[PDB]
């Protein structure tokens, strides 16, 4: 039995041991393109 100050307080590395057979994919989602706004730039200035 060792005094508290010398005990580990690091917990189990559950992130590193799982080893999922299929590595991560970027969870992209979409509501499509707002096509009613095509060829309607708001960057056009008066001259």
């Amino acid at each position: 039995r060792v005094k508290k100050s010398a005990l580990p307080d690091k917990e189990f590395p559950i992130i590193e041991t799982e080893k999922y057979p299929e590595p991560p994919i970027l969870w992209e989602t979409t509501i499509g393109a707002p096509s009613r706004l095509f060829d309607r730039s708001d960057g056009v200035k008066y001259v």
Partner: protein
Amino acid sequence: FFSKDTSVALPLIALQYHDIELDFRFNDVSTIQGVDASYTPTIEMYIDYV
């Protein structure tokens, strides 16, 4: 813990293999010393997504 500050919002997209579960418990409505009624409260949760 993540609602204290915008910036430490839960990076749900970054947690692709296991999900986030919030468990909690309710008192019978009658428990409150000043309880108002034997009325089943409607209880519904909203989550703010970024």
